Every structure is written in structure tokens, then in C-alpha cells.
Amino acid sequence: NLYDKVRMQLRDNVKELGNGCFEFYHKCDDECMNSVKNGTYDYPKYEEES
Amino acid sequence: NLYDKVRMQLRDNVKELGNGCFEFYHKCDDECMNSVKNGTYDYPKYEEES
Ligand SMILES: *[C@@H]1O[C@H](CO)[C@@H](O)[C@H](O)[C@H]1NC(C)=O
Ligand SMILES: *[C@@H]1O[C@H](CO)[C@@H](O)[C@H](O)[C@H]1NC(C)=O
After folding, report:
1. Inter-residue contact A45 to A29 (CB < 8 Å)
2. Residues 6+ apart with CB under 8 A from B26
3. Which of A43, B29, B40, B50 sits a CA distance of 20 to 30 A from B13?
4. Residue closest to A9 by CA, chosen among A43, A44, A36
5. How far is Cα B26 from Cα B11, in angstroms, rounded to an integer?
6. Where in the cell is it found (chains A, B) (predicted)?
7. Closest to A24 measured CA to CA, from A10, A34, A38
8. Backbone φ, ψ for residue B22 (5° rounding)
């Protein structure tokens, strides 16, 4: 449930590695990680691969 | 189970908003919505973002 709670919060700004981890497509510093662990996250334009 | 039944039926012609809702990438009128609620849906070329 944490895995999906987090996947839904993170949407497409991350990729699943298939081993229980999410890799970010943007620099995610302590302040970001602190946001991911609770009810918030918003990083709208970090696609490079698109 | 409805969330996934619907996600599988809708595939990539929709996006998950992460709050229990699916946003369509195409105009989806009453006739479409009536199809989504039961065993049918087929909208092959509505990507704009691709
Ligand atoms: C969520 O984490 C951020 C970052 O540390 C913090 O500012 C915010 O107050 C926290 N929200 C709750 C409800 O704890
Ligand atoms: C599914 O919904 C469509 C649209 O209203 C309808 O035409 C079709 O007969 C319905 N199928 C079933 C099995 O109810």
C-alpha cells in the first residue's frame, strides 16, 4: 500500500525500477524526499526523455 | 477492482490522476461514458502529446 500510495503521488515524474524503488527524473533533495514520505509532491516539467 | 477493471479497459487512452479518477485524452460523450461503465471501449488514435 505504501508502494502504491507513493506511486500514485509521484505519477510519471518517477520510474519504477521493479525492485520496490522509485527513481526520480529530477533532482530530489532532502526537502523533496521529506515531501514524498507524506501527502505532497508536485514537479510538473522534468521530462528529458520526452 | 473497478478501478483496475476500468484502467485495463481504458489502457493508455486515459491518464490516472492519482485521486481515483481517469481523465480522457479524447472527447468522451455520454455514449462513451456509457461504454466505459460496462465491457467495451475502443479509441485508437487520440494521442496529441506523442
Ligand atoms: C509534510 O512534509 C513537509 C516537508 O518536511 C512539511 O513542511 C509539512 O508540514 C508536512 N505535512 C504534514 C501534515 O506533516
Ligand atoms: C454497454 O453499453 C452500451 C452503451 O449504452 C450498450 O449499447 C450495450 O448494449 C451495453 N452492453 C451490455 C451487455 O449491457
Report:
1. no
2. B13, B43, B46
3. A43
4. A36
5. 13
6. Host apical cell membrane; Virion membrane
7. A10
8. -115, 120
Q: According to the entry, how was the structure determined?
A: cryo-EM
- Measured in Å, how far apart are chain A's first and last C-alpha atoms? 29
Question: What residue type is A5 in one-letter code?
Answer: K
The DSSP string of B15-29 is EE-SSS-EEESS---
Interface probe, candidates B3, B16, B47, chain A, greatest A C-beta count within 10 A: B16
Q: What are B15's strand-pairing partners?
A: B23
